[PDB]
Amino acid sequence: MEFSMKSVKGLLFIIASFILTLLTWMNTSPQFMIPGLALTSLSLTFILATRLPLLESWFHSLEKVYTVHKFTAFLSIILLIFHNFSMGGLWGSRLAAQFGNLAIYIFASIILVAYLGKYIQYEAWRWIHRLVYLAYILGLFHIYMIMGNRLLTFNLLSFLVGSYALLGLLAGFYIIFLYQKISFPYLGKITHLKRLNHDTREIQIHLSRPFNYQSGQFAFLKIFQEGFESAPHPFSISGGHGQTLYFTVKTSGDHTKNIYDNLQAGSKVTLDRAYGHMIIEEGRENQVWIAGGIGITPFISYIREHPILDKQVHFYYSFRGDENAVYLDLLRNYAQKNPNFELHLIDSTKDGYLNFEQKEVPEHATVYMCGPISMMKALAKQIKKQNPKTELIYEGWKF
Numbered sequence: 001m002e003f004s005m006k007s008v009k010g011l012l013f014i015i016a017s018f019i020l021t022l023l024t025w026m027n028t029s030p031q032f033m034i035p036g037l038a039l040t041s042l043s044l045t046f047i048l049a050t051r052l053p054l055l056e057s058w059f060h061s062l063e064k065v066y067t068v069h070k071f072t073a074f075l076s077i078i079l080l081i082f083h084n085f086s087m088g089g090l091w092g093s094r095l096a097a098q099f100g101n102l103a104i105y106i107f108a109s110i111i112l113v114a115y116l117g118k119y120i121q122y123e124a125w126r127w128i129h130r131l132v133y134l135a136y137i138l139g140l141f142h143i144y145m146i147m148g149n150r151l152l153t154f155n156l157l158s159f160l161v162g163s164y165a166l167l168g169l170l171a172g173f174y175i176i177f178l179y180q181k182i183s184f185p186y187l188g189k190i191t192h193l194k195r196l197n198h199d200t201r202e203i204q205i206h207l208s209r210p211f212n213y214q215s216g217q218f219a220f221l222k223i224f225q226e227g228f229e230s231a232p233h234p235f236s237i238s239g240g241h242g243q244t245l246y247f248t249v250k251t252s253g254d255h256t257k258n259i260y261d262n263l264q265a266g267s268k269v270t271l272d273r274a275y276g277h278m279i280i281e282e283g284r285e286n287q288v289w290i291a292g293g294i295g296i297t298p299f300i301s302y303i304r305e306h307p308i309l310d311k312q313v314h315f316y317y318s319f320r321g322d323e324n325a326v327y328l329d330l331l332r333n334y335a336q337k338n339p340n341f342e343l344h345l346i347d348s349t350k351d352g353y354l355n356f357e358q359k360e361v362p363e364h365a366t367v368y369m370c371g372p373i374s375m376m377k378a379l380a381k382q383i384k385k386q387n388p389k390t391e392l393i394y395e396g397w398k399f
């Protein structure tokens with residue numbers, strides 16, 4: 001039985017931090033039963049927030065990373081409840097107690113926005129969420145103002161505190177004001193803007209520095225221009241080698257609509273880094289491909305780079321009808337030139353969408369899936385129902 005090995009290194013970071021907190025506290029000084037955990041949980045929280053590649057690897061992918069972000073947050077806040085229970089009276093002297101109180105007021109408010117806020121419009125959510133930071137500062141003041149002596153000691157308590165808080169802080173500071181400016185500097189200019197259905201625009205980009213990524217990965221993209229929000233948004237390559245780069249976009253909501261029908265052909269543009277683990281090249285000798293139409297870009301990227309297949313690949317792409325269908329011709333070029341390639345294309349309009357019950361596909365083959373998350377999750381489960389002896393990876397674009 002072999003559940004989630006690589007993720008586990010990520011997990012250990014959690015476990016370790018916690019147990020290390022706990023033993024430390026009980027053996028030496030368990031003066032406050034709960035808070036130690038709460039705080040280290042927070043430390044972790046920031047650390048995860050970082051979009052740090054090193055721990056990206058450990059926790060595997062963004063999807064996983066952000067998942068754990070939520071996990072820690074949950075734990076933390078419930079524990080703040082119990083700490084607030086340990087207070088007894090909400091206002092207090094207000095000499096210090098109110099600091100703690102005030103922090104949780106804002107924290108609670110915002111974390112409680114998480115559900116409702118993510119419902120509609122995440123731009124606001126960007127800024128609001130960041131207010132969490134301010135509240136964290138207040139939290140630190142609460143404790144430092146109270147337990148000065150012990151923190152400045154040699155006690156493992158004291159170092160543990162120092163380190164875990166500090167990491168958290170450094171991360172915090174960094175993610176609030178730094179990731180955008182140090183990470184986006186990979187530089188870029190746009191090249192060509194090209195129009196496909198209404199769903200879609202594709203863009204070509206040239207770079208002050210020649211770029212690198214593993215085939216199938218993704219990056220976030222930031223722009224300097226006229227009344228165009230620069231904020232980084234997730235994207236999966238449509239082409240890349242050397243100085244040269246291409247991204248493909250479906251019209252989504254407002255920002256994406258903006259680039260669909262507005263983007264001025266000249267702009268100064270910025271790129272954080274490669275991320276994600278849809279590593280085509282690393283996949284098995286046989287690879288099987290599933291694309292929700294709008295979301296076929298990774299596949300495209302690997303087709304455009306390397307004109308000959310690593311090994312034979314079975315590919316399926318679902319697009320409803322020509323009316324939505326994009327890239328048809330470019331795929332078709334590939335097919336003609338590429339004997340090694342097996343290609344299936346679906347107008348879900350007629351007959352409908354694809355189910356794999358009445359399908360057999362070689363177990364000895366990694367399966368790669370990118371689509372609207374609904375379909376992707378469904379698909380996955382039905383393919384599992386086909387065969388656990390098969391190798392399967394599936395992604396849906398969320399956060």
Ligand SMILES: Cc1cc2c(cc1C)N(C[C@H](O)[C@H](O)[C@H](O)COP(=O)(O)OP(=O)(O)OC[C@H]1O[C@@H](n3cnc4c(N)ncnc43)[C@H](O)[C@@H]1O)c1[nH]c(=O)[nH]c(=O)c1N2
Binds near residue numbers: 397
């Ligand atoms: C790993 C990965 C890879 C890609 C993508 C996502 C992820 C997670 N996307 C999706 C891409 O983020 C999305 O299509 C646009 O950024 C939509 O931005 P709007 O401001 O229009 O979002 P708006 O809120 O108006 O609606 C679009 C949807 O995208 C979500 N979204 C997009 N960016 C977000 C962000 N930074 N924070 C939170 N939610 C965000 C919104 O939450 C919403 O559900 C993508 N798209 C694409 O066209 N081509 C691509 O190659 C990729 N690749």
Ligand code: HEM
Binds near residue numbers: 071074111
């Ligand atoms: C259930 C609890 C939580 C939810 C639902 C939540 C939700 C989110 C969401 C949706 C984002 C946007 C994702 C991104 O693009 O970065 C985000 C970002 C972030 N969160 Fe959280 N979060 C939670 C807890 C926490 C905690 C506990 C911390 C810190 C201790 C934290 C710190 C951050 C930071 C620093 C960012 C990055 C902001 C930026 O620079 O863009 N979050 N959170």
Ligand code: HEM
Binds near residue numbers: 038142143150
């Ligand atoms: C409404 C929120 C909170 C209230 C009312 C509160 C109240 C208090 C009170 C009354 C004390 C003793 C000092 C005093 O009474 O002046 C205290 C100590 C402490 N609180 Fe809080 N608190 C809150 C939130 C938090 C949070 C969110 C954390 C950690 C994340 C935390 C961690 C601690 C720690 C660590 C101590 C002392 C332990 C030590 O320094 O070794 N508290 N709190």
